[PDB]
PDB file of C-alpha atoms and ligand atoms in Angstrom:
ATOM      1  CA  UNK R   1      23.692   0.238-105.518  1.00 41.78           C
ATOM      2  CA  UNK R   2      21.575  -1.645-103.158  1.00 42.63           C
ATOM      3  CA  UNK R   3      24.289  -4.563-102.270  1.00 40.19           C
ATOM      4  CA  UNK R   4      22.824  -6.528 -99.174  1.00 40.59           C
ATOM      5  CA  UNK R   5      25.050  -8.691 -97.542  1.00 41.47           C
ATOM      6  CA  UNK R   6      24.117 -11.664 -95.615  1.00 40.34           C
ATOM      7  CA  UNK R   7      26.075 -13.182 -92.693  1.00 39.72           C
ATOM      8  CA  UNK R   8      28.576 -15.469 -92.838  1.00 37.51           C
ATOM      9  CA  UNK R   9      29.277 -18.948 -90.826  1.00 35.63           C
ATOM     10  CA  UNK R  10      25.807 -19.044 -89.554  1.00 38.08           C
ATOM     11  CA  UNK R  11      22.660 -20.697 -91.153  1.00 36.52           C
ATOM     12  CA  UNK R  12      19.686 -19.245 -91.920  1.00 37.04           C
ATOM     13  CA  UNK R  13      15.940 -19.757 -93.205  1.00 36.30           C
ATOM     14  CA  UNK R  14      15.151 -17.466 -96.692  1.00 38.46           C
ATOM     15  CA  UNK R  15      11.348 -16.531 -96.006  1.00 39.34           C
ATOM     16  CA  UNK R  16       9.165 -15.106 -98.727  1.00 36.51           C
ATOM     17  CA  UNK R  17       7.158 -11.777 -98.032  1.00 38.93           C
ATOM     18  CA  UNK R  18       4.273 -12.541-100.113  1.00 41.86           C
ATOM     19  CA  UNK R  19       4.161 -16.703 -98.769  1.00 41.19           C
ATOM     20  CA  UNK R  20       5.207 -16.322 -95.391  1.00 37.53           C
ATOM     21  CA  UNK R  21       7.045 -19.676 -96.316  1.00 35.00           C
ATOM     22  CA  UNK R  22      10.521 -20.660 -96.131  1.00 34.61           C
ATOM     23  CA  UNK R  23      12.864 -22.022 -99.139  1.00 35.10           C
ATOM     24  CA  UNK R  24      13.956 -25.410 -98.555  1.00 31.27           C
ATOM     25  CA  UNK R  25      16.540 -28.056-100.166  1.00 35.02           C
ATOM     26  CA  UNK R  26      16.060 -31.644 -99.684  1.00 35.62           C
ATOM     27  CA  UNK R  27      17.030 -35.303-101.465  1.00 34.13           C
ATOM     28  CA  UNK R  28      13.617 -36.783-101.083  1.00 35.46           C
ATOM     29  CA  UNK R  29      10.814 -36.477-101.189  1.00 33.46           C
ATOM     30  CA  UNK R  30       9.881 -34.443-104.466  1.00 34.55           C
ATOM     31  CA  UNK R  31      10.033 -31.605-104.610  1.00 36.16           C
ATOM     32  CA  UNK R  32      13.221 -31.248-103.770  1.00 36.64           C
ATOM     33  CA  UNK R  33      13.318 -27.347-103.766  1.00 34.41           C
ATOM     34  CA  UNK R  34      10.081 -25.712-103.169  1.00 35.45           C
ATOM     35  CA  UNK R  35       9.162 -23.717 -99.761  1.00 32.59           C
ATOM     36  CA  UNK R  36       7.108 -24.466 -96.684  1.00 34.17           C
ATOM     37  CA  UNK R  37       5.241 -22.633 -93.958  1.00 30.75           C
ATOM     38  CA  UNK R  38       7.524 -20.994 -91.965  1.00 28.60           C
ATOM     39  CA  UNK R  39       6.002 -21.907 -88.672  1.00 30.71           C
ATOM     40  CA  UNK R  40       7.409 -25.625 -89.217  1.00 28.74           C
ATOM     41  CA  UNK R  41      11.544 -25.735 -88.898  1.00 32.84           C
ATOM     42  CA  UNK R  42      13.100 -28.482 -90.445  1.00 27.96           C
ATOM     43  CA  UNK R  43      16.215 -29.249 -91.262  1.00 29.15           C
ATOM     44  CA  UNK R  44      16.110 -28.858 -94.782  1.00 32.54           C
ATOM     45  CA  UNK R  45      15.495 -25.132 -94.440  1.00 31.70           C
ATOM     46  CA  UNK R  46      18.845 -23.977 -93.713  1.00 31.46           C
ATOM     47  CA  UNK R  47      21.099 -22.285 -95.947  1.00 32.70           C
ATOM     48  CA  UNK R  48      24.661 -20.377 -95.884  1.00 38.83           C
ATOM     49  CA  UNK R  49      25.904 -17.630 -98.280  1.00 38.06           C
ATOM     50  CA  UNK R  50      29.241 -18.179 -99.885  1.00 38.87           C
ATOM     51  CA  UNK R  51      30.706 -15.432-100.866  1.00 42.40           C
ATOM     52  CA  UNK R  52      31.415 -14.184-104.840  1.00 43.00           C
ATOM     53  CA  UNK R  53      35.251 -13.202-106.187  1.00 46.35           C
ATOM     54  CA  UNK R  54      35.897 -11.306-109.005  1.00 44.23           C
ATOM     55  CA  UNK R  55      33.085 -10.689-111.358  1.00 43.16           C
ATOM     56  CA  UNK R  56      30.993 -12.159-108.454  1.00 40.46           C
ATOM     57  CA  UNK R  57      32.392 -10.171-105.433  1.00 41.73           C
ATOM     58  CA  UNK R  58      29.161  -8.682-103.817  1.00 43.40           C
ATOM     59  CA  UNK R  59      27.155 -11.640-104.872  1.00 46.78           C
ATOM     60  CA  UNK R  60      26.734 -15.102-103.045  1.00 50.20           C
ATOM     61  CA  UNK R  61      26.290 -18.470-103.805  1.00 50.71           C
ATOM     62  CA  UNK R  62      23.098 -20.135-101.655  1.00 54.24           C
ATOM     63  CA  UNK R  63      24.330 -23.259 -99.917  1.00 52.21           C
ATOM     64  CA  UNK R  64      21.993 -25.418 -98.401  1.00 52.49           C
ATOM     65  CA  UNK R  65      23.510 -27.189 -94.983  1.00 53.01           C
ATOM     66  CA  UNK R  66      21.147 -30.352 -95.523  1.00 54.54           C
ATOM     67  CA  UNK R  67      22.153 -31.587 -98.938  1.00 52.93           C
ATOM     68  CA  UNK R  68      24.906 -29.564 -99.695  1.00 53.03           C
ATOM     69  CA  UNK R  69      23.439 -28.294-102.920  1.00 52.74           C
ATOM     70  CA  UNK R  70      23.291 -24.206-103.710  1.00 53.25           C
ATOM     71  CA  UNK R  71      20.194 -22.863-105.335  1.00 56.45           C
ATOM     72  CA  UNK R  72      19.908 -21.736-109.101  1.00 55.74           C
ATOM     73  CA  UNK R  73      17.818 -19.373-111.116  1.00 58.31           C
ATOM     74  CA  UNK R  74      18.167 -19.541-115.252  1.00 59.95           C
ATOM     75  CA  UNK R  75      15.330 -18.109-118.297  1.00 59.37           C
ATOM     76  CA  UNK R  76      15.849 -22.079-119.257  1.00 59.48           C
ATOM     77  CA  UNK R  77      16.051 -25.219-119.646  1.00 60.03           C
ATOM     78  CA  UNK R  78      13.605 -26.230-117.219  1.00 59.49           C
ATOM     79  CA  UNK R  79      13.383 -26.420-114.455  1.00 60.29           C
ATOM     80  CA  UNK R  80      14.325 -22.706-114.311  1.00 61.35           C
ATOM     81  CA  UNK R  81      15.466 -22.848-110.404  1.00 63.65           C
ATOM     82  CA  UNK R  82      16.517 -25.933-108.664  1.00 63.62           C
ATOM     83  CA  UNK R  83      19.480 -26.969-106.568  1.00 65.84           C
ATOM     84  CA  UNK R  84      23.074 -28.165-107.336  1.00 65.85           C
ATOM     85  CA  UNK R  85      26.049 -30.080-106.064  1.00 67.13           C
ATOM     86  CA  UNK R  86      29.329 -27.445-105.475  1.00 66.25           C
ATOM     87  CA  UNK R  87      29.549 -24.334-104.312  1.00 63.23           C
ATOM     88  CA  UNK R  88      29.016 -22.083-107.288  1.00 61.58           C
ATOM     89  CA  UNK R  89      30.836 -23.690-110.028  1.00 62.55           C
ATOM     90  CA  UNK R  90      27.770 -22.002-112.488  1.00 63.51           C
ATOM     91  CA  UNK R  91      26.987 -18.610-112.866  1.00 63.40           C
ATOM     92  CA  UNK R  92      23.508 -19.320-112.487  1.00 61.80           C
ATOM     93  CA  UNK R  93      24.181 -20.153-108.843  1.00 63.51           C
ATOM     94  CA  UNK R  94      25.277 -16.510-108.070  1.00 61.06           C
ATOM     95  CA  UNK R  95      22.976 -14.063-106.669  1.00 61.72           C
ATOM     96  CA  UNK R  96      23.135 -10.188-105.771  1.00 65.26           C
ATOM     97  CA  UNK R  97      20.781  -9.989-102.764  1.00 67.89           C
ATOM     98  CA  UNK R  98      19.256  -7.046-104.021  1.00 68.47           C
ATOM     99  CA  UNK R  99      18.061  -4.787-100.679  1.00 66.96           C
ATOM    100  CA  UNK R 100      14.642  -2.984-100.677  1.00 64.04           C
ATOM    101  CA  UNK R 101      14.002   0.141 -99.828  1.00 64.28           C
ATOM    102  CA  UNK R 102      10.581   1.366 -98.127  1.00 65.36           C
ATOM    103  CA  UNK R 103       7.684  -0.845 -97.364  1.00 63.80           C
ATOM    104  CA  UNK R 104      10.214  -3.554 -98.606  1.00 62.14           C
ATOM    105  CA  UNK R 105      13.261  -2.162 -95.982  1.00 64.64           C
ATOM    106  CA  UNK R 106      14.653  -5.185 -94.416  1.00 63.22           C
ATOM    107  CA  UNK R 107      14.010  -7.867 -97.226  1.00 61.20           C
ATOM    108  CA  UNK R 108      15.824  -8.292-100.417  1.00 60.92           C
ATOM    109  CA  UNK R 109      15.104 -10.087-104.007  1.00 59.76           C
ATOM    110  CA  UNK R 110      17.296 -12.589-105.033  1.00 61.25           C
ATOM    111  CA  UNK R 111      18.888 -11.515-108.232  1.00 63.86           C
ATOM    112  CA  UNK R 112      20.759 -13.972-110.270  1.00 65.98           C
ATOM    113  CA  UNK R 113      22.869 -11.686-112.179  1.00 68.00           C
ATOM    114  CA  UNK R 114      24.151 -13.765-115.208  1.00 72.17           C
ATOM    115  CA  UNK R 115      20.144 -15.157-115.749  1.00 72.24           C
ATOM    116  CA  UNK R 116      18.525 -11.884-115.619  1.00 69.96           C
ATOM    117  CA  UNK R 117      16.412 -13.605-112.978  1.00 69.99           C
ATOM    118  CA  UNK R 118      14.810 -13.013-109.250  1.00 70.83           C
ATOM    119  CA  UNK R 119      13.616 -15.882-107.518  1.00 71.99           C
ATOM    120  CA  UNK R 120       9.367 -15.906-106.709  1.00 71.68           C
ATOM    121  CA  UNK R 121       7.729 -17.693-103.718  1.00 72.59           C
ATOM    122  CA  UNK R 122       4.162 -17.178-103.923  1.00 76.30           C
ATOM    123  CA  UNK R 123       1.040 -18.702-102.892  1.00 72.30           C
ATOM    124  CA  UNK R 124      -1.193 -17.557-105.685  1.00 68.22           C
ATOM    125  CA  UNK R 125      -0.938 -20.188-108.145  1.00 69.71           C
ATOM    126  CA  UNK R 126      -0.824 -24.094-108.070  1.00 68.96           C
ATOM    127  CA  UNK R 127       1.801 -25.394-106.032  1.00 68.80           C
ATOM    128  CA  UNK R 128       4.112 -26.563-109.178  1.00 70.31           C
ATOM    129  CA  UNK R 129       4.681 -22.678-110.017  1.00 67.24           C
ATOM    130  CA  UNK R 130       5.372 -21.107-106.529  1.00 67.23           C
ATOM    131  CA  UNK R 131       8.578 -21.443-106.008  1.00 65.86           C
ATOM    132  CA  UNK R 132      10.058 -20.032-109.849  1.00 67.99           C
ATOM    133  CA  UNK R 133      11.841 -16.741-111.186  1.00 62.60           C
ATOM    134  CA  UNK R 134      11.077 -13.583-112.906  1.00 58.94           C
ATOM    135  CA  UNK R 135      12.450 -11.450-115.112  1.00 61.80           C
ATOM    136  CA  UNK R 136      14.989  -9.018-113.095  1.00 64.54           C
ATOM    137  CA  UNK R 137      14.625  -5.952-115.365  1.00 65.42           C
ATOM    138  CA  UNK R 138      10.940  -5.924-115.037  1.00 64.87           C
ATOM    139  CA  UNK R 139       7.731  -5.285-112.962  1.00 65.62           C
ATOM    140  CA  UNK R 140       8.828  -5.945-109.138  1.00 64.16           C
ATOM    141  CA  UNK R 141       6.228  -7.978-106.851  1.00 64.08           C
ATOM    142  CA  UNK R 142       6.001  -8.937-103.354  1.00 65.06           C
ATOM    143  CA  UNK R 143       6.784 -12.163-104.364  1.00 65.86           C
ATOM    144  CA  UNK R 144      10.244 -11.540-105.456  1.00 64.44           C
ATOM    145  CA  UNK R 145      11.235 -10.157-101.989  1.00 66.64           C
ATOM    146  CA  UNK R 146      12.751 -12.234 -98.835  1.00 68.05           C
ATOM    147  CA  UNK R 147      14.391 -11.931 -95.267  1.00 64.69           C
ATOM    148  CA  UNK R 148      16.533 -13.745 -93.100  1.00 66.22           C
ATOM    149  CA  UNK R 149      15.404 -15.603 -90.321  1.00 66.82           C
ATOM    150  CA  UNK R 150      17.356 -17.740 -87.759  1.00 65.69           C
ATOM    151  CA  UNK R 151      14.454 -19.003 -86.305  1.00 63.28           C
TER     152      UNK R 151
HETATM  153  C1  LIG N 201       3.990 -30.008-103.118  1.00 62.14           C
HETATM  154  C2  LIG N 201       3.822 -29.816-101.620  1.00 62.14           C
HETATM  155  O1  LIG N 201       3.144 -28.952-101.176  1.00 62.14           O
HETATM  156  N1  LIG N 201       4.520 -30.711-100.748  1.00 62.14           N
HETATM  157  C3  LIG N 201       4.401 -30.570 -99.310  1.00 62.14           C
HETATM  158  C4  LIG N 201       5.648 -31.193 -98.666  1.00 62.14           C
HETATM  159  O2  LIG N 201       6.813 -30.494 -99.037  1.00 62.14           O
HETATM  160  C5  LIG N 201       5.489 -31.213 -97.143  1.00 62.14           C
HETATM  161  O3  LIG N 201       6.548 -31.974 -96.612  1.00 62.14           O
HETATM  162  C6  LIG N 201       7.252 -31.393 -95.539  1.00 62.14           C
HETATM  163  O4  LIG N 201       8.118 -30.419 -96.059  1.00 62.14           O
HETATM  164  C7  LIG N 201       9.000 -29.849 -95.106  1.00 62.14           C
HETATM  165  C8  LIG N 201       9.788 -28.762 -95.834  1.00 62.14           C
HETATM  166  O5  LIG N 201      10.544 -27.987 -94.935  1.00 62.14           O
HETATM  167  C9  LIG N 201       9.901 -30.928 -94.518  1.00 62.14           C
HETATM  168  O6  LIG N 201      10.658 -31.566 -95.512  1.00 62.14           O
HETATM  169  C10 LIG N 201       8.994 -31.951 -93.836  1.00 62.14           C
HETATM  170  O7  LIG N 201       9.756 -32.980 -93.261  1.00 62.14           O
HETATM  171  C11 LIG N 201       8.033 -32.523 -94.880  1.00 62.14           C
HETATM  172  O8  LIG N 201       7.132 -33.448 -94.311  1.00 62.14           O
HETATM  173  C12 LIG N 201       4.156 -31.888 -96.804  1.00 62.14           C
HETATM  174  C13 LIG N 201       3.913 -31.903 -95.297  1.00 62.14           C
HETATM  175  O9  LIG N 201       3.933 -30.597 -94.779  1.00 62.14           O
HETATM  176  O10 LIG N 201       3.084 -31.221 -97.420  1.00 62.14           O
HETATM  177  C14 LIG N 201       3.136 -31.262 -98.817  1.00 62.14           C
HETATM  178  O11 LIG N 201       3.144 -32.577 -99.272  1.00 62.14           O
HETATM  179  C1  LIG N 202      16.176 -31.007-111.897  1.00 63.66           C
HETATM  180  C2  LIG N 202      17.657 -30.723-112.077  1.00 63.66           C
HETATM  181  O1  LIG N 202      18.267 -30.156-111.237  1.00 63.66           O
HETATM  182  N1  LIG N 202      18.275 -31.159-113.301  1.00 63.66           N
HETATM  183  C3  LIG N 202      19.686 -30.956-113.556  1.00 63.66           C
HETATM  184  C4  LIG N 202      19.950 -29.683-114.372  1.00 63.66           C
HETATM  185  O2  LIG N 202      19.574 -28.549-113.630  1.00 63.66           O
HETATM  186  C5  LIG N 202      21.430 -29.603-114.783  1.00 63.66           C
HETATM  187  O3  LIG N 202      21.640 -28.498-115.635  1.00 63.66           O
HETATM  188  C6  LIG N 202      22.716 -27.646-115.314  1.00 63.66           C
HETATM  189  O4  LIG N 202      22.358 -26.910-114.172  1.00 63.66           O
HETATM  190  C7  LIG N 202      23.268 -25.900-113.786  1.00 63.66           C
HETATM  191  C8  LIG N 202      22.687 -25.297-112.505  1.00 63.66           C
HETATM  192  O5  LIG N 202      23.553 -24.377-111.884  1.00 63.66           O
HETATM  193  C9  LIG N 202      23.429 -24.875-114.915  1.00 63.66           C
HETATM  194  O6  LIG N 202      22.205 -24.251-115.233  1.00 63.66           O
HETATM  195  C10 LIG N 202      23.939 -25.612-116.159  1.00 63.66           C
HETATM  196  O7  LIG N 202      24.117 -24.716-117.238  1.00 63.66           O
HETATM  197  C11 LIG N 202      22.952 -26.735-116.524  1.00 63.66           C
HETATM  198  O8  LIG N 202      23.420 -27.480-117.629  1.00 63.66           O
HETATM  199  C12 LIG N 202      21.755 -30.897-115.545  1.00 63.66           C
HETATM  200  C13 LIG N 202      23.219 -30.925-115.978  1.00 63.66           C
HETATM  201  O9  LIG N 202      24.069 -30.777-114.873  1.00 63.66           O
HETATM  202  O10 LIG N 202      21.502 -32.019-114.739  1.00 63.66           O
HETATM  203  C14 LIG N 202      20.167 -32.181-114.337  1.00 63.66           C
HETATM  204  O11 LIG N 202      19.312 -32.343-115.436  1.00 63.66           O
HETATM  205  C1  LIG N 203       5.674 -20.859-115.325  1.00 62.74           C
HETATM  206  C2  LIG N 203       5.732 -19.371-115.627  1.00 62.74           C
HETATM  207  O1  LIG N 203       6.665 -18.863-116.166  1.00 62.74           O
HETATM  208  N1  LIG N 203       4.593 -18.613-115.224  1.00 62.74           N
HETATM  209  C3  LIG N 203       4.528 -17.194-115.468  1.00 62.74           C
HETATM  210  C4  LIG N 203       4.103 -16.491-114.174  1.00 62.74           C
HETATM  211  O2  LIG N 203       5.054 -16.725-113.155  1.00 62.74           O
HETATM  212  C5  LIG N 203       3.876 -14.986-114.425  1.00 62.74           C
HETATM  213  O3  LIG N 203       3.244 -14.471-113.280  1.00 62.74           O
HETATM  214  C6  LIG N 203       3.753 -13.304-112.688  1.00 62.74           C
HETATM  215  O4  LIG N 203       4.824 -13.677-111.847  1.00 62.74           O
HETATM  216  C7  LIG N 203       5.243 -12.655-110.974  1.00 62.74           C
HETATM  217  C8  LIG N 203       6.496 -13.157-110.256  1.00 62.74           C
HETATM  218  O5  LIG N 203       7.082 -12.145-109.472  1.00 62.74           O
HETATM  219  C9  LIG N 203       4.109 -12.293-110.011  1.00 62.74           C
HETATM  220  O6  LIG N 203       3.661 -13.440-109.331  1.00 62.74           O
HETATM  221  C10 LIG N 203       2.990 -11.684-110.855  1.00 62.74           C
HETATM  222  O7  LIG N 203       1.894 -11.380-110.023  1.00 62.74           O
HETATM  223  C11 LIG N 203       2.573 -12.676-111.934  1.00 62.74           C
HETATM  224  O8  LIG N 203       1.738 -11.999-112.851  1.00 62.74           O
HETATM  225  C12 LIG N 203       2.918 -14.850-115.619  1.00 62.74           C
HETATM  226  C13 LIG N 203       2.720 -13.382-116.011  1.00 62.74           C
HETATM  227  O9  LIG N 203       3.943 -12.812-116.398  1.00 62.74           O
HETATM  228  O10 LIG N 203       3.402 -15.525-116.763  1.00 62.74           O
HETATM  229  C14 LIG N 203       3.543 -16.905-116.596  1.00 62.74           C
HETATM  230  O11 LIG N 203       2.292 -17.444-116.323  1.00 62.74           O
END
């Protein structure tokens, strides 16, 4: 239950509900994956969803069109989400976008299925702890849930 799907062959921008900021993925400077103010577009915020086969069909991979990289999400080692080159070769890379229902109808968490992770992007701790994961099969926060943007 509760399979979103994104589109396909068009990039988007992954904005938190709880931040108002967008993910991002980026070669330089450090960090190279953390989120930004979604009122500033930049390149680096622009992602496509590959789509899962087999064990991973209703999932996606999160590919970001300015390094190439997809996202991760893992309990360990650090860091526990990051970026990587490919297009899902790990099964950390795959994520059920996981639709909400309610007050959170129209935004999704971003379930890495094989970590038992969501991803987080909050504001209310220091910046090196904003843009993390959760434990999927637990308490569920603002800050686990996101939306599409194309602009
Ligand atoms: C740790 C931290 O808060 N760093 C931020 C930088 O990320 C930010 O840099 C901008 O980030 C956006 C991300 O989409 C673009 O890459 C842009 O070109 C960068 O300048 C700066 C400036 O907003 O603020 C902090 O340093
Ligand atoms: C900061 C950073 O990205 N370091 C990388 C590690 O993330 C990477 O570890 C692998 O990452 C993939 C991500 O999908 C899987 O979690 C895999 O199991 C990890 O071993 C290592 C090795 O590629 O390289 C850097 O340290
Ligand atoms: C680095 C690390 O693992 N820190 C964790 C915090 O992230 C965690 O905080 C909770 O995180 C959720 C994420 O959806 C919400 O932000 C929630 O409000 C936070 O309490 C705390 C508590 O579990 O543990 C570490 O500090």
């Amino acid at each position: 239950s509760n399979e979103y799907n994104p589109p396909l062959g068009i990039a988007f921008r992954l904005c938190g509900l709880a931040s108002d900021r967008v993910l991002f993925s980026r070669v330089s400077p450090s960090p190279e994956v953390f989120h930004h103010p979604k009122s500033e577009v930049y390149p680096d915020q622009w992602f496509v969803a590959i789509p899962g086969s087999g064990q991973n069909a209703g999932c996606y991979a999160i590919k970001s069109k300015n390094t190439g990289k997809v996202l991760f999400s893992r309990m360990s080692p650090d860091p526990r989400v990051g970026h990587i080159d490919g297009d899902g070769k790990y099964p950390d890379n795959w994520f059920k976008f996981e639709a909400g229902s309610g007050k959170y109808a129209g935004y999704f968490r971003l379930r890495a299925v094989a970590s038992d992770t969501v991803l987080v992007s909050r504001t209310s701790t220091g910046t090196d702890t904003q843009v993390i994961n959760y434990p999927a099969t637990s308490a569920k926060y603002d800050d686990q849930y996101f939306t599409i943007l194309f602009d």
